[PDB]
UniProtKB/Swiss-Prot annotation:
Belongs to the AB hydrolase superfamily. May be involved in strigolactone signaling pathway. Essential for plant responses to karrikins, a class of butenolide compounds, structurally similar to strigolactones, released from burning vegetation that stimulate seed germination and enhance seedling photomorphogenesis. Mediates a specific perception of karrikin. Required for the establishment of symbiosis with the arbuscular mycorrhizal fungi (AMF) Rhizophagus irregularis and Gigaspora rosea. Karrikin binding induces a conformational change. Pfam families: Abhydrolase_6. It comes from Oryza sativa subsp. japonica. It is found in: Nucleus; Cytoplasm. This is Probable esterase D14L. The keyword Cytoplasm applies. Keywords: Cytoplasm, Hydrolase, Nucleus. Component of an intracellular receptor complex involved in the detection of the smoke compound karrikin. Expressed constitutively in all organs (e.g. roots, stems, leaves, panicles and embryos).
Length: 271
């Protein structure tokens, strides 16, 4: 064991390849299992680090410090502690949903630790603003948080199909509904509020490591224009690939389409 960082985040390292280190970081409502279809494609060429974000279902709620995680910085500090403990000189970081922004934030502090960021289903701001389309108004958020607080289980059951998209009887929808409901309900409401009310747009000019912006063409939480926004405001080189998939966790729900795209963005560098 690497110690508390491993135990607290259920951290695992798999693969024996020599081309680099990859760190995979999941979105709200899921856990490292979201990467189950990607990892087999990476173990020949890479060492792959998987971990659960603090507050995720599989983590000990006693380690959830509300003051630490009241901003997204807390999660970025956790990521930097993982990379420091692993003695990583450099990694390829793939961040899903909120973990995309968490990696971007961490890369501002320590750009040396990241050769590239793959930003999957990423958004710097969910709320609409003047000349900015995120996909949500405050009233939408308020209605969502009221549903979460009124019956969390029912909310999970209704939200998962919308978020995952596609056929509501799919194994992916069922998996996500269960991982959503694994989060302790106080942590879930708090975290959803923190993430959905976030706005990191003014930090994007500080991100200088190359970014690969990948998303579904139809995503509940991420209008396609957000990818263009990211591409036009990140402070370093970037590329955008909008996939012919639907859903916010497309690496889980449509891996036949999505895993080839993620593998390409991991293997090929922008000029």
């Amino acid at each position: 064991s690497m110690g508390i960082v491993e135990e607290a985040h259920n951290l695992r390292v798999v693969g024996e390849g020599k081309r680099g280190v990859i760190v995979l970081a999941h979105g709200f409502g899921t856990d490292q299992s979201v990467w189950k279809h990607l990892v087999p494609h990476l173990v020949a060429d890479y060492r792959v680090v998987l971990f659960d974000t603090m507050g995720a279902g599989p983590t000990n709620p006693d380690y959830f410090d509300f003051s630490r995680y009241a901003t997204l910085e807390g999660y970025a500090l956790d990521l930097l502690a993982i990379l420091q403990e692993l003695r990583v000189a450099s990694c390829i970081y793939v961040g899903h949903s909120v973990s995309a922004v968490i990696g971007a934030i961490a890369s501002i502090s320590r750009p040396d630790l990241f050769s590239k960021l793959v930003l999957l289903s990423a958004s710097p701001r969910y709320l609409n603003d003047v000349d900015y389309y995120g996909g949500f108004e405050q009233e939408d958020l308020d209605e969502l948080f009221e549903a979460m607080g009124s019956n969390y289980k029912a909310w999970c059951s209704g939200f998962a199909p919308l978020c995952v998209g596609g056929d509501m009887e799919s194994v992916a929808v069922q998996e996500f509904s269960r991982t959503l409901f694994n989060i302790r309900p106080d942590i879930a409401l708090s975290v959803a509020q923190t993430i959905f009310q976030s706005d990191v747009r003014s930090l994007l000019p500080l991100v200088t490591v190359p970014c690969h912006i990948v998303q579904s063409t139809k995503d509940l939480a991420v209008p396609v224009v957000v990818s263009e926004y990211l591409h036009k405001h990140l402070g370093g080189d970037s590329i955008v690939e909008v996939m012919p998939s639907e859903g916010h966790l497309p690496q889980l729900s449509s891996p036949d389409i999505v895993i080839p795209v993620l593998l390409r963005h991991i293997q090929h560098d922008i000029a």
